[PDB]
Amino acid sequence: QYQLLINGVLVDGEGERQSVYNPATGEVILEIAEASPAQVDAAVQAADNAFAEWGQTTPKARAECLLKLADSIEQNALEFARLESQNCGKPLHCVINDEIPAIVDVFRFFAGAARCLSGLAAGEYLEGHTSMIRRDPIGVVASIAPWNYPLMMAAWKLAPALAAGNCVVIKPSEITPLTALKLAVLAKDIFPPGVLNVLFGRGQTVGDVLTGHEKVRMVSLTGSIATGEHILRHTAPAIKRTHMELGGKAPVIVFDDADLDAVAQGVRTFGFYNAGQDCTAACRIYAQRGIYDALVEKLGNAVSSLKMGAPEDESTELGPLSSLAHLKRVTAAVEEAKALSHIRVITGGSQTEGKGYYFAPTLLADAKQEDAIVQREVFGPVVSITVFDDEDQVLRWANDSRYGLASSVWTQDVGRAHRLSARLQYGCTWINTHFMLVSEMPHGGQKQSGYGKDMSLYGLEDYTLVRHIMVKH
Template identity: 45%
Template sequence: MTDIRRSTTALITADELPPLKHFIDGAFRDPASAETATVVNPATGEALAEVPRGTVDEVDAAVAALPAWRETTPKERADVLNRLADIVEENADLLSRIESANGGKPKEVADDDIAGTVDVLRFSAGAARAYTELGAGDYVTDHTSFILREPLGVIGAVVPWNYPLLMGAWKFAPILAAGNTLVLKPSEQTPLSMLKFIELIAEALPAGVMNVVTGRGTVVGNRLADHPDIAMVALTGSVGSGQAVATAAGESLKRVHLELGGKAPLLIFEDADLAAAAEGIRAAGYWNSGQECGAGTRVLVHESVASEFVDLLVEQVSSFVIGDPAAGEDVEIGPLVSKGHFDRVVSAIDTAVQEGASVAVGGRAVEGDGFFVEPTVLTGVEPGTFAASEEIFGPVVTVETFSTEEEAVRRANETPYGLSASVWTTDAARSIDVPRKIDAGTVWVNCHLVLANDVPWGGFKGSGYGRDLSLYALQDYSRTKHVQINHARR
């Protein structure tokens, strides 16, 4: 029986909850519909709040909130973003506890999310003032050209349940820095930290610049995608959600920014530091209970060292502290976000075993309250099976073997995803050559899931297109205009 740390202490009190309303044009508004979604604490299964389900009319009202934000200078926008970062820092403990209570995040994960939110706001504030473009000049005789970078307009942003505030910041920080306004839809499952954030920063942001409408993706998300006055939809979510948004956006030819699923391969070669690889996967494969699109979940290890590596990995995974985030700061693995997602992850493990995989450690749901699944390692996974190909999105790492470098690269690329990957080797030439051959937007060498706001994040193939973070994000959320002046003297 897996030992689960339980707690009878609540992470947040009722008076710390945000207003359970939509935020439109600078104010919280009573919902038009009485329909709500129940938000639960996944560590206990108990209800935390009832959040309104928005309507098409409420999305339209948010889109119509059009302040003169685009006319502000980069410095003015940067000053506002830095003020928002200050407010998040001042309320870091509260926001972290809300993330833990609503998402089941251990304190280390929730604290990291809040720190990341602060940093992406500060990076975007600086980046707003540091665009570089082609220099003005006469590229045609007697005609001077210069390049303007302009905001797109109103952007619809759809944020996932696994990082409700951090992924929100990955969207709204560069969107606002580039001079756009936005309407943001948080996940129905984890909307509380975003609603609290907007409550805290309401007076620091001009009315109408950022609006939040809660509700179903099929209603609120679809309206953002097909609204004629929205210039772009930015979504982090599942492949199915991305396909639906891209299809709807295609009717009006609006731009789409998609950060979708992943099935990150980790190529562990015979010359790798196996102990370091196992320790790295302990973090990269199970961070946020594996509910992470870039998680290192699909190990491809050379057959000559597979047995030794699996022993090291099992030792690492067996040492996790599992439990309710309220039960102590040393809890490392929390619950999955919902009963529905819990059922999907348990079913995926069962399917893998039916397809021939073996459970090296874990592999079971945990009895009792909450949506806990044991940290799991599956070995003997065959190419082409469900576990080798599809995103499980839980605390599950699969292990396959390969015999040659060419096979490893081919197998790494055989899934429909292309978000991230890693290569583990002490061969200098291989560490440069193999990453070039892998179809993934980020390839780490001798590490995995190491992120920085200064560098881009995004995928290829079924993992979507567009880039979060870095100057590339601000470029995605803006447009270039060429102005040419004929100055010939006659």
């Protein structure tokens, strides 16, 4: 049975047993005991005590811990890949080739970034007084990881927090805790006792006790708009600082000018990768009238060829949805779309028969801007196509969204590419590609998609405190 990491020691949860499912088979993998309210407190106390020493360590010392942690993960790559695949339904080959190396890279990046923090020039801004600017750690940080990319999001939250010199108490999703608890075993001795704490449990029993704790200085979350609203109004009286990543409905803007085959191949991969359970998924397509019909046919052929199957089988391209509950939300969202007279189901449409939580790759055409399928996030293997005419029009539509995380523009015109990317209200804009992320570049939303960034130097800065020290001569 997997254990919890509290103050450098592995312990069994004193809370209620919770069952962890295998989304590909619908069967229960294991049963893990949650953290009790007293253990959540114990974890925060451990972090609070550890901070006095850990917050004074040099960036060099911290970089060395992160590099050591990265090595541990890389050496255990295969094991993490099997767990992540078994617990999430992600095709095994994708985890081994894409995710694990990305995770390893994230730690290495932050190890380096920890020693490169920006400041302002120290000097005499006021006659006879030397001012300087330092970036100190915040203190105790509570991290809540989502279920779509369990280990990767854990990395996105641990790396910058630890690099900045904070103590962390992280809770993975109750749906997907395996990789996080495995990491806890390896990282146990890498950091001083209390610096890293890994808990387990539901957002109602463990999550709320953790985020509401008086000694937690910052709460970084990744989830849906629903679970994000809950935490932001729960931590409001304490005036805690937050870091929000709350999904998105990434628009894919295609002009007549675009390479249709490249768009089709891109949407085939990026709109259905990880069963479309991704905040940056290419799920909302705006196709210009001229190429609309041609693109719809190409997408139809590309999407319908996606092979669904066993995650451990090399040929499998599409896995199942994370849980029974999520399968129901996706089904409902697709049914509302089919109910609309003008919506054409090009391929897929409903959930497939079998043990797992599989849902057929769906392509919905002739969708209109006002439709729910275009406005609300589905977070499943569903893609919609909407026709448009001019730039001004598509730009207004893209920007008239509650979301603002990622987007892509497909066009060959240099002028148009830069003109739109400058005006889109999305934290990220790809041109003639989509879904590509790198450790050096920031990833974060705008509007209801949240605030604060993952990865890059900006990601590290969110876990620091700018401080002004002024000495009088």
